[PDB]
């Protein structure tokens, strides 16, 4: 049937602008083992340093931007310890850095959007870098000077999959509210996860070689005014799922010493078992038969998952090109990573001169994962260039 | 104009079922000063004990349900200290209690609903009692055995206003997804805020006399099947707002010793200045002229705000009856409090035999507040009985 439009939106939610940002300080992966084991006063565990050398090189990561410098770690030595009371000091750094880093990505995205900031009616903010009261959603509202009546959603500590959660949330906000313009900001950092090495906890050490800082920002709206606004993608469907037989696969305890992770169950085998059934369910209303006829955004939380999925569905090596570029150039930035990849994919399609923002393909899938074991899946539709 | 219904819902979001729950252990307010100053090994600060006696009696609170017993505090003495490392112990108690308490409220609400749990497509979970990874939204999904493909939203540490945020979120989920049934669960406790007294920090002591444990649960859906489903209220509008000149009015730092509050600015004066402009804006599409022609749900975070608002708009003393009942019988349960009040208001209207679930009135306003200074406002429409 047909319903009265009233105050709701007509068409599907669309990505209207994107931008990213990182702290200025970065670390090359080739130099990181020496720096890490030095500032964490840990040069004596030489056998662990060799293990970290091997782990860091299999990450296929080149550089990672980080708020934490040697000087900051020197004035907060408990953060460099493997396990010492440091939460309040980490949260002071989060208050001084997380909303500000999110404003840098938001400013660029609003600049590309072209419309006034007073047209932003909703704000979705994801971060696992610090629990703040009021949250970083409020701090960004003040720094940007957004409307005091903005409808905000603060998402604390959902994990690495929250990039898909933010897209899933913004979709419902924009499609159900006429004229709604949703600012999406994922601002992440290692302020809660960074700690010294332990020969006992190799899970925590492995995460020290991938996690990095960064912030992504989007403008999501339905019914775009095509004379002033330019859509980049369409959010057609977004769903969440808990993988079967995956209890306590990823657990992160927030303690007096910050965020401590635990990864007992095998993650790549869990994704490899379910990846096909999930993505086929997402592509069901599209009629796509070739896995290589769509563009891809996979959360590079574990690079081995990129390789095994590339093999299992027999993808062109160029399909995951934007995914591996962000991983190589920026590392794992929690929820911001998949939005970084969506922007790099957009830029690469425009640069190499292809017909669609989705590298010439019409449909695309976004897939991230985290504690649950939770899987977030989004079906995207590209636009002509 | 008219748009194709497609996969969206036709009518506004409706509250289809409600229920509450509390821990079995409770404390009468008349006995609390002796118990508090005894288990926090603090009987020697006699002048502070007298201050607490006076504060506790002005709360107009009778009893408060609490997970923390004397024995539990005895096996976790750092929780009883004013400021000692205790976060991990608090989060162990949150893992063992918060999802379970939310399941008790959810079971009763699903029982009143009558439909199978496999019809629940969305879950919204609010808590400020513990940051968990995976969250209490996942734990409830497992305990209830809800669909693994449920769309979840975990809201950590938004504060006291999150009861209105959950209603604001569920409204968009139900109205934009056809057939969607949204389970809303606010499960709160003092596991992060409870601590010993300090003659230095009187803000923290005042919160020790109001905050309490409890969980509320709703089923929210649009387009109700009126032969099996019975609506109780309608969510017509829900908005968020930051009050002008209110920076750092309520701040809660999450530290190694748990949640420490700071309340420097005057809260009742902030609400009294803005309460009328906000509620008039919410009632604008209703045509209501008498403030006593609508029913009321005000977050009883500060009882002085109930009295000043009652005076300022000259309300019948019976308007805030359900609000003061929950405050007297249960205290401040963070986001669950206003949903407790909505249920008591529903029960009181049915018991005293009135024409509407809103005590005979047609329209009603829900109003909660917290860190920001943030204000959440919801316009409700009652239903015939």
Residue numbers in the entry:
A (entry chain A), B (entry chain A): 7 to 391
Mind quoting what the paper says about this structure?
The last remaining candidate gene encodes a PKS (PECPS) sharing high amino acid sequence identity with the other four PKSs, as well as the highest 93% similarity with AsCHS1, and this gene maintains the Cys-His-Asn catalytic triad conserved in all known type III PKSs. The crystal structure of PECPS showed typical homodimeric type III PKS folding. Crystal structure analyses suggested that PECPS utilizes unique one-pot catalytic machinery that includes the release of a diketide-CoA intermediate, which has never been reported in other known type III PKSs.
Furthermore, the crystal structure of the F340W mutant indicated a similar size and shape of the main catalytic cavity to that of the wild type, suggesting that pocket A is not required for substrate and intermediate binding during the enzyme reaction.
